[PDB]
From Swiss-Prot:
Protein family (similarity comment): Belongs to the protein kinase superfamily. CMGC Ser/Thr protein kinase family. MNB/DYRK subfamily.
Gene behind this protein: DYRK1A
Modified residues (Phosphothreonine): 271
Tissue spec. comment: Ubiquitous. Highest levels in skeletal muscle, testis, fetal lung and fetal kidney.
A GO MF label: transcription coactivator activity
Domain Protein kinase as annotated: residue spans: 28-348
Record remark on domains: The polyhistidine repeats act as targeting signals to nuclear speckles. The histidine-rich domain (HRD) region is intrinsically disordered and promotes the formation of phase-separated liquid droplets that enhance its ability to phosphorylate the CTD (C-terminal domain) of the large subunit of RNA polymerase II (RNA Pol II).
Active site as annotated: 156 (proton acceptor)
Localization of this protein: Nucleus; Nucleus speckle
Biological process annotations from GO: circadian rhythm; negative regulation of DNA damage response, signal transduction by p53 class mediator; negative regulation of heterochromatin formation; negative regulation of microtubule polymerization; negative regulation of mRNA splicing, via spliceosome; nervous system development; peptidyl-tyrosine phosphorylation; positive regulation of DNA-templated transcription
Protein name: Dual specificity tyrosine-phosphorylation-regulated kinase 1A
Organism: Homo sapiens (Human)
Parent-record interval covered: 132 to 481 of 763
Keywords: ATP-binding, Host-virus interaction, Intellectual disability, Kinase, Nucleotide-binding, Nucleus, Phosphoprotein, Serine/threonine-protein kinase, Transcription, Transcription regulation, Transferase, Tyrosine-protein kinase
Amino acid sequence: ERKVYNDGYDDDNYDYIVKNGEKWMDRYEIDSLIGKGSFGQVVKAYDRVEQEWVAIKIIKNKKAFLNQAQIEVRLLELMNKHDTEMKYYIVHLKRHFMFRNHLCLVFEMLSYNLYDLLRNTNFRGVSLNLTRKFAQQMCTALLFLATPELSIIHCDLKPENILLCNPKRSAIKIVDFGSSCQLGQRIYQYIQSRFYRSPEVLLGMPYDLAIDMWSLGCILVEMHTGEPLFSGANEVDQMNKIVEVLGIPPAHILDQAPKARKFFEKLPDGTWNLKKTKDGKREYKPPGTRKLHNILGVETGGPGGRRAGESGHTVADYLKFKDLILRMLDYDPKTRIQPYYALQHSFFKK
Ligand SMILES: O=C1N=C(Nc2ccccc2)N=C1Cc1ccc2c(c1)OCO2
């Protein structure tokens, strides 16, 4: 098999074969590939006509992907057009078009994504002050998505999709609404990147805007610790790693959860344990015995003690932080902290 795909324009994974230097439509001059992804690719390009850099997202050339990309565009256009100043936490879709059988979304050019940021500081993690700054921005963002007329679930929050507007600055915007959808109009059950996946989704329960808040919890912790909080290799592993920190989930949730039996079992007395495990195998810490309080290093100089004796990393501060995250990681989506209240939390009080 060495077929030629799309008159030689595409590779075998439906991606457009990026060539640096190429000028499209006597307008966009393609500089370089900046990133790949299930959706396709993103390229750095200079827009002659508007005299500015843009980032163009070249969707795979396959109906399945195109159809999704269209929903994305539609949502990007509701958010961009919406009124109050909160609309500058969502990336600006400048325009979009078909080219060589690829749908292309032209975005404002932005800087690093929070993962690339983490990596540049060799995964020692960013400061708490800065983690707070991202925290506050994201929260306002989620409140924007909450406005009734939008009611948008992102469904894939994660460091790669939070980008800096400027490399020597702190201001940021959310990207990639490929998986996203409006409340009610929910059409997928396997959503969210595994590490950042919520319990409700894992359990195969129905889900709402709450699931993004969850992801944000895991993000913020990771951003400071340098390393993801629930690093599951698979759904079962992921659920156990959540249980390590947060315990068995509540009766009233597991009772209603279709996939509850993938991970847990119900004892005669109506209480839930983790599923019994092969004769002798020990692999996890006992439920709730991996206290966030130590992962964060609240009383021991922060994560890995790497903040020992630093300005702006007081124990009092870490406590405020722990509490916020813990309300972002509420098993119950009906009682998980909502943005309006998250913003009025002691961790943001100047
Ligand atoms: O919708 C998206 N999905 C993306 N996926 C992605 C792109 C690069 C690395 C990891 C993930 N990127 C965007 C948009 C995007 C928008 C503006 C940009 C940008 C990327 O790179 C920096 O400028």
